[PDB]
Design an enzyme around this catalytic site. Sequence first.
Site, short mmCIF file in Angstrom:
data_model
loop_
_atom_site.label_atom_id
_atom_site.label_comp_id
_atom_site.label_asym_id
_atom_site.label_seq_id
_atom_site.Cartn_x
_atom_site.Cartn_y
_atom_site.Cartn_z
N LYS A 193 0.33 -26.57 -22.62
CA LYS A 193 -0.89 -27.31 -22.38
C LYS A 193 -1.35 -26.94 -20.95
CE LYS A 193 -1.74 -31.73 -24.74
NZ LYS A 193 -2.90 -31.12 -25.45
N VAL A 224 0.80 -1.23 0.00
CA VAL A 224 0.00 0.00 0.00
C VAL A 224 0.83 1.28 0.00
CG1 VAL A 224 -1.80 -1.16 1.29
CG2 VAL A 224 -0.08 0.20 2.47
N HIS A 225 0.16 2.41 -0.23
CA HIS A 225 0.82 3.71 -0.23
C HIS A 225 -0.08 4.88 0.15
CE1 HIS A 225 -0.28 5.18 -4.53
NE2 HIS A 225 -1.22 4.40 -4.05
N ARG A 242 -5.84 3.41 -16.76
CA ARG A 242 -4.84 2.59 -17.41
C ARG A 242 -5.54 1.32 -17.91
NH1 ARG A 242 -3.04 1.42 -13.79
NH2 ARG A 242 -2.29 2.83 -12.14
N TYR A 297 -10.28 -3.03 -23.21
CA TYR A 297 -10.35 -3.61 -24.54
C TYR A 297 -10.88 -5.03 -24.73
CZ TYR A 297 -5.55 -4.35 -22.79
OH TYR A 297 -4.38 -4.62 -22.12
N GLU A 343 5.27 -8.92 -13.78
CA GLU A 343 4.32 -9.63 -14.64
C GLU A 343 4.92 -10.75 -15.50
OE1 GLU A 343 2.03 -6.82 -16.91
OE2 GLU A 343 0.50 -6.58 -15.36
N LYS A 381 5.09 -8.08 -25.44
CA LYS A 381 5.62 -7.83 -24.11
C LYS A 381 7.07 -8.26 -23.99
CE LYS A 381 1.20 -8.05 -21.78
NZ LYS A 381 0.43 -8.29 -20.54
N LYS A 409 7.46 6.21 0.45
CA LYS A 409 7.12 7.59 0.11
C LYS A 409 5.74 8.07 0.53
CE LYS A 409 7.77 7.56 -4.29
NZ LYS A 409 7.48 6.10 -4.41
C1 LIG Z 1 -2.54 -34.43 -34.38
C2 LIG Z 1 -3.99 -34.87 -34.31
O1 LIG Z 1 -4.83 -34.32 -35.01
N1 LIG Z 1 -4.31 -35.86 -33.48
C3 LIG Z 1 -5.69 -36.28 -33.35
C4 LIG Z 1 -6.10 -36.25 -31.90
O2 LIG Z 1 -5.93 -34.92 -31.37
C5 LIG Z 1 -5.75 -34.85 -30.01
O3 LIG Z 1 -7.03 -34.64 -29.42
C6 LIG Z 1 -6.98 -34.66 -27.98
C7 LIG Z 1 -8.41 -34.55 -27.50
O4 LIG Z 1 -8.50 -34.92 -26.14
C8 LIG Z 1 -6.07 -33.54 -27.47
O5 LIG Z 1 -6.64 -32.28 -27.77
C9 LIG Z 1 -4.69 -33.63 -28.11
O6 LIG Z 1 -3.96 -32.47 -27.75
C10 LIG Z 1 -4.80 -33.72 -29.64
O7 LIG Z 1 -3.51 -33.96 -30.21
C11 LIG Z 1 -7.55 -36.75 -31.74
O8 LIG Z 1 -8.48 -35.84 -32.30
C12 LIG Z 1 -7.69 -38.14 -32.41
C13 LIG Z 1 -9.12 -38.63 -32.47
O9 LIG Z 1 -9.54 -39.10 -31.20
O10 LIG Z 1 -7.21 -38.10 -33.77
C14 LIG Z 1 -5.84 -37.72 -33.84
O11 LIG Z 1 -5.44 -37.81 -35.16
C1 LIG Z 2 -2.01 -5.16 -24.66
C2 LIG Z 2 -1.13 -4.99 -23.44
O1 LIG Z 2 0.09 -5.19 -23.52
N1 LIG Z 2 -1.74 -4.63 -22.31
C3 LIG Z 2 -0.99 -4.61 -21.08
C4 LIG Z 2 -1.76 -5.34 -19.98
O2 LIG Z 2 -1.92 -6.73 -20.36
C5 LIG Z 2 -2.88 -7.45 -19.69
O3 LIG Z 2 -2.24 -8.21 -18.66
C6 LIG Z 2 -3.19 -8.95 -17.86
C7 LIG Z 2 -2.42 -9.60 -16.72
O4 LIG Z 2 -3.25 -9.84 -15.60
C8 LIG Z 2 -3.94 -9.95 -18.74
O5 LIG Z 2 -3.01 -10.89 -19.27
C9 LIG Z 2 -4.64 -9.21 -19.88
O6 LIG Z 2 -5.28 -10.13 -20.75
C10 LIG Z 2 -3.61 -8.39 -20.65
O7 LIG Z 2 -4.25 -7.63 -21.66
C11 LIG Z 2 -1.00 -5.23 -18.65
O8 LIG Z 2 0.20 -6.00 -18.71
C12 LIG Z 2 -0.67 -3.76 -18.35
C13 LIG Z 2 0.20 -3.56 -17.10
O9 LIG Z 2 -0.48 -3.95 -15.92
O10 LIG Z 2 0.08 -3.19 -19.44
C14 LIG Z 2 -0.65 -3.18 -20.67
O11 LIG Z 2 0.17 -2.61 -21.63
#
Ligand SMILES: CC(=O)N[C@@H]1[C@@H](O[C@@H]2O[C@H](CO)[C@H](O)[C@H](O)[C@H]2O)[C@@H](O)[C@@H](CO)O[C@H]1O
Ligand SMILES: CC(=O)N[C@@H]1[C@@H](O[C@@H]2O[C@H](CO)[C@H](O)[C@H](O)[C@H]2O)[C@@H](O)[C@@H](CO)O[C@H]1O
Lengths: 359, 365
Positions: free
Chosen positions: A276, A64-65, A313, A293, A255, A186, A92
């Site tokens: 993932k 805080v400030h 901001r 935005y 950040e 960024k 400050k």
């Molecule tokens: C590369 C590709 O297309 N692989 C197909 C599988 O894709 C996967 O889907 C699972 C869903 O739980 C997960 O998102 C993973 O990240 C993906 O790679 C899937 O669609 C499969 C059919 O069951 O076909 C593969 O060819």
């Molecule tokens: C477009 C851009 O760079 N915007 C900056 C802000 O980005 C956001 O960050 C928050 C994080 O909680 C979230 O990811 C959101 O989707 C983003 O758009 C942010 O970083 C800000 C500083 O606090 O600066 C902006 O420039």
Amino acid sequence: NVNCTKILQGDPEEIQKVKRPRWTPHDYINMTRDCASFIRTRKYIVEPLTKEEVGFPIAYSIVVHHKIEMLDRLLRAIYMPQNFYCIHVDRKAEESFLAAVQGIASCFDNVFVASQLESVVYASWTRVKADLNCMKDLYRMNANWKYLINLCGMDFPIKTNLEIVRKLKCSTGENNLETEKMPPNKEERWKKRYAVVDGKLTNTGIVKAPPPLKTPLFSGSAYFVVTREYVGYVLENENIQKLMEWAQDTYSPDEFLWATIQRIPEVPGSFPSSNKYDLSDMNAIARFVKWQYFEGDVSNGAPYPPCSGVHVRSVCVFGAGDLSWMLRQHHLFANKFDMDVDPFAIQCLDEHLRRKALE
Amino acid sequence: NVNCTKILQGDPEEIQKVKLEILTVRPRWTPHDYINMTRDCASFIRTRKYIVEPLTKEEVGFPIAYSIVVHHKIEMLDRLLRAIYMPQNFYCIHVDRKAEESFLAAVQGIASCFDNVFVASQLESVVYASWTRVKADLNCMKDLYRMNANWKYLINLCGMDFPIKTNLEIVRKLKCSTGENNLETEKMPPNKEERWKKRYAVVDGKLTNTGIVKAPPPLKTPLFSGSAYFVVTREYVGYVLENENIQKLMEWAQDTYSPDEFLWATIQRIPEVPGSFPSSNKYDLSDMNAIARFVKWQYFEGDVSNGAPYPPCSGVHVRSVCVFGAGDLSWMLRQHHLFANKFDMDVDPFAIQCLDEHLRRKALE
Ligand SMILES: CC(=O)N[C@@H]1[C@@H](O[C@@H]2O[C@H](CO)[C@H](O)[C@H](O)[C@H]2O)[C@@H](O)[C@@H](CO)O[C@H]1O
Ligand SMILES: CC(=O)N[C@@H]1[C@@H](O[C@@H]2O[C@H](CO)[C@H](O)[C@H](O)[C@H]2O)[C@@H](O)[C@@H](CO)O[C@H]1O
């Protein structure tokens, strides 16, 4: 005269009716001379509400400030005996503000002012160090708190302390912060060395060396929900140190540092660096924030509805109109609120959490 | 003849032992054996050791519903069913019509021993990657929906799935879902658009691309990519069974490839759908972020401390999907998912074996 329950339901009537004598640090330095009275009158909670909560201690790092009266309401909103609250006052702030915080902090043995205070400059390492100072104190002063939630003067919770513990349990020993693939926009933040020229952090134009990390840099928020094990690790670990000093001269290190740590193999409660496992601000539970935005029609690609208050901001400073939707989100705390923009967003929220916590 | 504890702790020597244990060779039940064994329920239940007594007051107050889709391997079905059986829950089994009569009888057999376990009133002849796979689950949803109104969530399972959390652990995560649905749902990738752009027909038992381009989706909201597995609230199920628009969306998907890997992911992003998420991509759940099913894909495995979602598979790979070996168990149990896939008794009974007792031993507390 405002009917809170209605605001909490979206009721357009109240929203419209909503959408002066104010306390000062001196008024606080005076209200706190006698702790027992301050606490009783200000209705702070000094008796654990459940054994479940007593069994799950939380720690807080509040930076805080000013706006002494917000800090007061914030603290009370999240205060419990089993928890630990380390307040960081900007080197400050108004000397009376500082003295006022001490007065509130010194009425509870679990509330205190960081042993080291930084002079905080926007988007600079100091912002992180502020939170670091707090981690150092909280980590060493007790080994029983589960998680560390870092807040700021204009945050306010949208969950009771019970709900927070339960969600922290659902986390099953894992951290929870926004952490995503580095947006190209960024990268300039950490590819150049920055420096404070005129009280402003500016780009020196010097290209920085690559991060001393095998893991890539991730982008996130400055707020987080990390386990005690995480804190000890960034505090002790020999490598987290190399990274941290490298980030010292970067723009807004807060950040990207926490989010990057969260994806380093050896870190407690971390995630694999595979995208993932990325967590966006909406998926993470740390903080609900509305960016100008992105607001729009939630029935057409918008994360959330438009802001009922104002924007500073690009960040929506909530208004009584936002409450209804906001309360249905899974986040622990929302940001930001301002007594000077809408004390009703805070009042209604305030009472609701207290009532909901007492039922 | 092998220390499970070690296997769950990831001991290399021990994992290595199951390998020697397999090649170096047993009791193998069959559909008929089950048709006989089920003759006397008391015995079947007691023998096979089915927890026929609710474990806690927390679970009794939180009923779960399962939709299990199977076509073969009756001993696997019984093991999976015992691993997730709880008197307060509800289990709807869907047997493929192309299944052997002895198998269906076996399931009708088991199902008779439990008032909360039953075969779906409408069975489909499932074709791989076809709309019929979605219809099977839909058939169960209706039976479970009309049969009871007190189960909270419905979890759909296939024959080779196994749980990696106890029933209480599951109930707890569902309570944490706080009324939301949990399932994979991400931005539709380009290489999978071809699945619904063209029409598909079954040719020689395999779904093939006719070339006939189809009408755009009956949706204002986009199409999302996901999996056939989900966790949804009794209300999500209700809405998809009664909602008009969804009907128009489902029938429109009947001639698509793997309608099950975009259908549910998409309905979860539709405004007004109970427990959905904003269409905004900020709410996209990857397979690792959702909790429905832990599954490793051959092209993603590798060095976890270098970008890989998970480490290399210890079993084998059927269609790029990893069939778990004892060696995978350790890392897998640390994941937040409810169930894993896939397991094969013929690939490694030890993986199912350890995982099986560990979960039971843990439920008993
Ligand atoms: C590369 C590709 O297309 N692989 C197909 C599988 O894709 C996967 O889907 C699972 C869903 O739980 C997960 O998102 C993973 O990240 C993906 O790679 C899937 O669609 C499969 C059919 O069951 O076909 C593969 O060819
Ligand atoms: C477009 C851009 O760079 N915007 C900056 C802000 O980005 C956001 O960050 C928050 C994080 O909680 C979230 O990811 C959101 O989707 C983003 O758009 C942010 O970083 C800000 C500083 O606090 O600066 C902006 O420039």
